[PDB]
Amino acid sequence: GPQSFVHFTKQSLALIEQRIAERKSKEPKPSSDLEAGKQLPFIYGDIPPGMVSEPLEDLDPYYADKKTFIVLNKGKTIFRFNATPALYMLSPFSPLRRISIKILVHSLFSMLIMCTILTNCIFMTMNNPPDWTKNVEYTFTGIYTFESLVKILARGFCVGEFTFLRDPWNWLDFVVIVFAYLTEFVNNVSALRTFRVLRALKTISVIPGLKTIVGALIQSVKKLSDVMILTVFCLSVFALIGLQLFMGNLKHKCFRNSLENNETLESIMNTLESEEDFRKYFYYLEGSKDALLCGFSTDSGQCPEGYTCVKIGRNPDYGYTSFDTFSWAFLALFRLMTQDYWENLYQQTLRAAGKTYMIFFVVVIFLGSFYLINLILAVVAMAYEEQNQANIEEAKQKELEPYWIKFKKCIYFIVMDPFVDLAITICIVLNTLFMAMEHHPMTEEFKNVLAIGNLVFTGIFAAEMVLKLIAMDPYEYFQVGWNIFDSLIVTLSLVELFLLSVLRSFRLLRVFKLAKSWPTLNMLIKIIGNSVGAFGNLTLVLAIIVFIFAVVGMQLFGKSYKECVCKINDDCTLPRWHMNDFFHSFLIVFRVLCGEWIETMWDCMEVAGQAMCLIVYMMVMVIGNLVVLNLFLALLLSSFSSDNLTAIEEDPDANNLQIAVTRIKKGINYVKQTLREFILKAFGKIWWNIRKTCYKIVEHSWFESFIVLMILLSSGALAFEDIYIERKKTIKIILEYADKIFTYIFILEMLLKWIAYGYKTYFTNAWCWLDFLIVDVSLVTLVANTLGYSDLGPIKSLRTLRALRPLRALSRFEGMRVVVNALIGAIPSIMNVLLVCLIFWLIFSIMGVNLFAGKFYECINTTDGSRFPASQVPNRSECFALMNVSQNVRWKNLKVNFDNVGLGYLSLLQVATFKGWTIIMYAAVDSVNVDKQPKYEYSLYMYIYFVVFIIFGSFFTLNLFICVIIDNFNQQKKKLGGQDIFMTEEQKKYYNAMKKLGSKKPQKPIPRPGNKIQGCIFDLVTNQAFDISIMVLICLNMVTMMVEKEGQSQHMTEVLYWINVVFIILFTGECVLKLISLRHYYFTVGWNIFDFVVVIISIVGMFLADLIETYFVSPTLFRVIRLARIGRILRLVKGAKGIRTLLFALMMSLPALFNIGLLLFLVMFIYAIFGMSNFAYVKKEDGINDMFNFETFGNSMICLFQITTSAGWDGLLAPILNSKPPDCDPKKVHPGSSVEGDCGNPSVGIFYFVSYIIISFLVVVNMYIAVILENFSVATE
């Protein structure tokens, strides 16, 4: 009804209740389109003018029977009400109620209540409000109170379907105003103040379109039920394992053996309170809070001579890193799963209980910190996608339902499309590369050249702006969106010229002007614009959440961090990362979002209570991470296919570079012919039998097996060559002679292949080229060895290429071949994405080197490492005048900094990875000017550089990479038929078969044995409650395993032993009765097999454990055999179904990750040998110490496994860059060996670690893809 608008009058009141009167005298869903909040449809057209914002008749047929009315805005918005008097007082024509509606149905109302809130927040941002802010507080309270009031006497308190209190979001305004009145009248208050924070959550109510956003987040969380259950379960199981193994281990410290005046461990340990007191009796490395660990084994930490390894004291890191009680094990393994500074746990456990406990930390990082995270990112994605899909479907369905003129035209013909634009772009690239040549120790001449260049370029760009501005009118000139940009840039240039350092660097964004001829940069601009465009509300939500958590953290913990600073920092001054300001609170919340959430949490707890710190941090992390994952996913899927679908042609107005390039092939090809025409115008069977033999032999599986075994022996033989080789002299001789034999066999290999396949086919295959190069290396090395040229420079740096010997393995292992082909098919694309990322990071790097370059120098008292305070010695000359009279003073940089664009790229690689960025921010935000001693946070507001950087380079670039990888993989899968690209042909059979195990629904129900007694046993076991009970008692046993702690008591140990015995007895009994029931059928059920096995292992374990402890002595074997019990828990999996399917997905996916694991192991082997050869003699520093280093194959594989997750790689890399003393010493003696010098080579070191981190990143991306596609395949099935 387009023209059915009737003022809701006395007759409306009159008519309605006799309708409802006959309904109650005689005793369909409402129009979704017309339901309030949305917009009025176009079917009713326009509204009579005076009828707007008035009580109107009800349109929806469903509500037509009942007694309501609707009021419509000038913005065509539906506001429905109920015609019952408000509080039985305000009838629909009471004059107060009319004007109340007029306010409520008015946009300026929202504008006011929003302009108040967005200033209330800015008032929240202050930690110590001045006395004048009481007035503001009171006025704010008044505005909220009466703006809620205008709701009440219009909407209605509680007597209606539509009445105020009904909407959940009008709960919050009510509660805040009543609490504000309360606290104002009951007059610590910090908890009450936290609810004033709650005000700024009305933001979500006021601005439209976030109601839907938060609804979406809620419905998307609703799906992560079973994954969170399984995360809790798996974390708990590994927590039990870690509890059993390491209970009390991290409490080891080295205690002096020479105590004077009759004391003991106990006698001291009762009377000790200091760090100094603990230093006089334990072993503390220089500059550390915790006591050095130690272990009772040969593969553990070694106490200094004079100390003995004892278990006493407090656990490390204030006492919070432990495996002592179930809860602390949960905390430690959650820290492992989120990989938050897990490498310190890695080193602490290894130093405590030994290196051979590396297997534990491997099984978890592979499973816990990968398989859970993927299951989460896959579930969230899968949800999101369903909603985007339904949304798109719905949107679609709904849509479906005189002289001036002379020279201006002259200049316009001098717009010449093919060429002037190319001149400008080459000017752009020449500028950017000219501005990438700053550096700190830059001479005055370079300074001059750079300045002059900047000036010439500025001039050219400006000239083209003014020329085209006179060319065509500003009315259209300022319509082209790129035009506004250029004008802006020229204006900025002029302002810079006539006056900050940051202002020098807005001439950089011209690099985007190449995006016209650059399609991948167009993709990137599509992401950047999208995040402020069609998904800008979700980014606003992220901003809101960060604000809320920032201010809550400040309100709760702010004072604490100031009364209790001495607990967390020795100098009685606030730490670096604290919650006493709004800005620093924001920084800590940002850091929690990036993923480094313990250390701040330890400080938090140490000053302000474990419970409130824990609840906040866990909540911050979860909520934030969820919202960020949702943003990432959205952008990725929008940009994936929903961004554009090639609706328009490739550069519809053919690209000016493509117009230009035609004039090039017009030029180059024609002129190529003009110089061409002018220059011509001016001027027997036996050999084939040998071939077929050699062909036949090399194909034979005996030969191939021989060569594979040969390759494995070479690979292994490489690993013996370490630092300790001079000790094992016989092995030294054997290895030389075996290497000689090996090269012999391998050249015979070459000769047979050459004659078999022929030179051609052998030279046109990649693997044969690889082997050819390798055996060439071997041959040259051998000959030079036998000719005495065995020590002359490069022929010793050529030997270190023996480490490439394993690279022959890839050509023999199928899985390795299939992974290599899959990863090589996607390099072409990855290269374009990488190059965009590089130019972008180059813009950031020039911003950096302009802001910071040359200012990280600082005097350092090298004995302790404390920079001299800027009260005395504020500058260079002072640092030198100090060294000449004092000592151990140096003007020392950071070695990874911004002194030029290259080191800039390096330091940015550190920041974007969060592994070592902390020292860069610290030494940057301290900066003053070149040749100046820094001051503590003297430039505090440089952290925003890092925040912006972090945001773009880690968040958008990661998105871009992931998008391209997925796209290519889709290509690499779709083209071949859906085949998994990580599985060999036999692996495919296995997978297909393993799939049919997950598809069998029915089985015969085990006919019932005849005899009455066993029949009763049968109908007992097959009853539903039997299993329910058994799993209840399984949980009752799991808790019996949880209740243990550290040093509990003698009595408790026995009493738990006895409960354990009773459970064991019941379980064994169930098993026996079950067997009796399904006689001879027990084994038809794989789960029952598992069960038999566990019962048996468990009985065995109890008995064996008893035996060993009683007669033998073996603590470690005792603990490792008491782990048989853990199997009893794994039967929780039986009853579940939300977990079985997920673990069956992991079982499905296993072989692919097997092949990537093989490739990763081979790469780790090669890099291990490389490290063994080069960095076995570097100094011992940040990451390289007495236990984690490259001196041996075990140590090097430990270090590389650690940085496979990219963890702590800056720490290892830092002691390799040192060179040219005083950083190192090149004339060290190194007893027991002839090598000299103790510092490494920067270039090879940088190559080593950078190369490794990209390759590790690429293989783990492949692992991600494998598990994620497996989950999609299982879930949609």
Added chain:
Amino acid sequence: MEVTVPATLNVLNGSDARLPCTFNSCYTVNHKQFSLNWTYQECNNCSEEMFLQFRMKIINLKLERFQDRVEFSGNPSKYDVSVMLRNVQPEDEGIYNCYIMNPPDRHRGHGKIHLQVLM
């Protein structure tokens, strides 16, 4: 270190006077540094006088007119350093001071109490 004290104290003559000095220090009070300085002064012009303290153990200097009437009646571990005034007279009417230093917290606490006697 905030100090929680009643600014004005009226106690009946001859009765018992509870003079509460308390603080909230986040650091565990340890007797090997924590110090209590118990002083009193009558008129602002007239001089401050010390009667109790705490260096290692509770020290009472047993002053004239403060003799055998003051003993420590609180325990520093639970942040309570209250003292009692036995059988108050008109004389002790004046302004009472409790100075607290609780290392390692640097800020030196200070409570002030006005004691008045009613006939």
Added chain:
Amino acid sequence: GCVEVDSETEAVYGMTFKILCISCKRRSETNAETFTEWTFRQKGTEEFVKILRYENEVLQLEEDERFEGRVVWNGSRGTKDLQDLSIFITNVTYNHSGDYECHVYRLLFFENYEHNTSVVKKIHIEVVDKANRDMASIVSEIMMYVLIVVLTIWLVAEMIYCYKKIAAATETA
């Protein structure tokens, strides 16, 4: 880093010999101050006699007419944290065959107290007229050649067998 490698046990006559004695420390970062004594029991005598003492930069040689000018110090230099204590013999004789002990006394420096430990290394020395080649080296060399030759004959045997087979098949074709 530091590796404790045992000394070689044969010396050729009328030549140079270095008697290796490395004594690492348990933790590499500590700080010590060490000096070393060497005693030497000749083959046939039953008592060990002090021969040389090294303290802080100076080797003090005992007045023994078998080591007048034939030993010069050759371990770690320029420090007091001696960790490689090898000596060098510059002119070997037949009186140098006997039994040795490398007495290293290490006084450590810690946060509040000092340790006086002790380590002893025992070396047996046989002087000879010409250098005998190590048994493992000889066996390894002959093994290298014997595997080389057996692999050659294995391969050629397969070449002849496959040649006969394919040739026969070709005549038949």
